[PDB]
């Protein structure tokens, strides 16, 4: 109060000093709406995988490809994502991820990359130089290779030109490298493009099969196809379905509508919000703040003071003021001498008394305080209007004064205030 009053000695009277603002305790990130989908098993766990010459294009959408499911899918694989680390990609949600899947060899791993060349890079599947997305490359020796000799699986050895970005081609025409036409019969200058994969149990690791799944997203005008907690009556920072803000998530009683989510009120504030995961209505109230004022009976008389957090139901957050919860400090008054809930906040450091006296320091709602000894201390009596008096009114009783009193009373009225005159050019401009 001395700082706000900017004086070393304050007089009797309640002074407004600062504002008590209860800080939020926890943060709730509840935006789940339960909801989960997208299988990955169709593109990852399938026992039979399409060849490189017949690579699939299955864009997963309208569900979430939780990468933690696929982060650990096999002993070892190359999660060669492009443009973003796979871990950072987890929460990085993408509009239309075109998930492509196929199989390659071991020595051809270096040949399967954007801009690569060869009978399987230029001639089976070409990635753009500006390719955005990921490549998932694991081995499937026990699945895509046969111990009896897997010639059923084929890798194309000849094709004409490089594919366009993300383009497909499965041409199986008998290619001609000379002048003699094929005429529909295999022979001179007639080569089949598909060469059967060399997949033997005794074949080297360079000839060992390796599946390759290319999940690629195009950042377009689509929903990112691809994280929660709980709470109680305590005040927190709510994040209900991306509704930023802090408040008291008290239980609600209103009835929402099957489609309404973000309840509101007359003001812009979100008065209520339906709880996503439980499909229940939650009531949002602002954190119980309020100004704090100090009741003091005048430095001269005493340094003892009592404070009043205006507009708070303190029988809660300011009576359960934990270690340094109350703004004016001195946490020794967490309970204080006496806490008296009032219609105008509540008093800390003043003890209520049944006896009613004349108002000395007004507080509000008919409650006043004074430094009256009972042993000088601050009391919080209820203001007394005056000494109740009854006049003996009767049908034939009259009271007539026998004396009088020439009482002289003083009345003070201001008449004029100090005359002033300014000058902008002198004032505004130096």
């Amino acid at each position: 109060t001395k700082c706000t009053l900017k004086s070393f000695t304050v007089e009797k009277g309640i002074y407004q000093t600062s504002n008590f603002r209860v800080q939020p305790t926890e943060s709730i990130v509840r935006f789940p709406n339960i909801t989960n989908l997208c299988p990955f098993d169709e593109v990852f766990n399938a026992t039979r995988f399409a060849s490189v010459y017949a690579w699939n294009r299955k864009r997963i959408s309208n569900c979430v490809a939780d990468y933690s499911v696929l982060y650990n899918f096999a002993p070892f694989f190359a999660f060669k994502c492009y443009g973003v680390s796979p871990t950072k990609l987890n929460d990085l949600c993408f509009t239309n991820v075109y998930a492509d899947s196929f199989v390659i060899r071991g020595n051809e791993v270096s040949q399967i990359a954007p801009g690569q060349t060869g009978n399987i890079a230029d001639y089976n599947y070409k990635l753009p130089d500006d390719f955005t997305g990921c490549v998932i490359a694991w081995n499937s020796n026990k699945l895509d290779s046969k111990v009896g000799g897997n010639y059923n699986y084929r890798y194309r050895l000849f094709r004409k030109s490089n594919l366009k970005p993300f383009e497909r081609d499965i041409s199986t025409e008998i290619y001609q490298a000379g002048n003699k036409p094929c005429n529909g019969v295999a022979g001179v200058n007639c080569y089949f493009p598909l060469q059967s994969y060399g997949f033997r149990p005794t074949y080297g690791v360079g000839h060992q099969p390796y599946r390759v799944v290319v999940l690629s997203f195009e950042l377009l005008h689509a929903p990112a196809t691809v994280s929660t907690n709980l709470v109680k009556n305590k005040c927190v920072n709510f994040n209900f379905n991306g509704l930023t803000g802090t408040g008291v998530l008290t239980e609600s009683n209103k009835k929402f509508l099957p489609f309404q989510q973000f309840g509101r009120d007359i003001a812009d504030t979100t008065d209520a919000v339906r709880d996503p995961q439980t499909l229940e209505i939650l009531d949002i109230t602002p954190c119980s703040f309020g100004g704090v004022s100090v009741i003091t009976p005048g430095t001269n008389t005493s340094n003892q003071v009592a404070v009043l957090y205006q507009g708070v139901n303190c029988t809660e957050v300011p009576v359960a003021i934990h270690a340094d919860q109350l703004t004016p400090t001195w946490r020794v008054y967490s309970t204080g001498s006496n806490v008296f809930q009032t219609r105008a906040g509540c008093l800390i450091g003043a003890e209520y008394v049944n006896s009613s006296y004349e108002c000395d320091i007004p507080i509000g709602a008919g409650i006043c305080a004074s430094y009256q000894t009972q042993s000088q201390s601050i009391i919080a009596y209820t203001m007394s209007l005056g000494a109740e008096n009854s006049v003996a009114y009767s049908n034939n009783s009259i009271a007539i004064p026998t004396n009088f009193t020439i009482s002289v009373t003083t009345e003070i009225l201001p008449v004029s205030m100090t005359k002033t005159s300014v000058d902008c050019t002198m004032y505004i401009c130096g």
């Epitope: 650990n72 070892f76 190359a78 060669k80 796979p86 020595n107 791993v109 270096s110 080297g204 690791v205």
Partner: nanobody, 124 residues
């Protein structure tokens, strides 16, 4: 690149003895890099011993291990081996499993993973 490297092997050998160590990758990889070996003797630096391409086609052998040490990879258990022969007095070194997270052995320095110590002593 959460490349889980597991180390195994070790012991005591004779001058001209032999050994076989196993290291492997798992979890998930940034890309198929280079599998190699290193020795960081007590107080010494990690020294290039031998690097091998993942597909057992591009092999490397250091001058000190030319004709003495050998490197090979298994084709059915995802393990890559190491041999050592004809050790001298100064070959007592600590060995950590090595890993190159790059497609080409540009230099002996660029690495992204390492192993744990392994004391090697030569005696009869």
């Amino acid at each position: 690149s959460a490349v889980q490297l597991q180390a195994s092997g070790g012991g005591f050998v004779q001058p001209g003895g032999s050994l076989r160590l196993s290291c492997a990758a798992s979890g998930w990889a940034e890309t198929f890099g280079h599998m190699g070996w290193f020795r960081q003797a007590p107080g010494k630096e990690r020294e290039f011993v031998s690097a091998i391409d993942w597909w057992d086609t591009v092999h490397y052998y250091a001058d000190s291990v030319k004709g003495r040490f050998t490197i090979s990879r298994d084709n059915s258990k995802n393990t890559v081996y190491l041999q050592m022969n004809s050790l001298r007095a100064e070959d007592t070194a600590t060995y950590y499993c090595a890993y190159w997270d790059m497609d080409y052995l540009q230099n002996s320095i660029p690495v992204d993973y390492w192993g744990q110590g392994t004391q090697v002593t030569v005696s009869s």
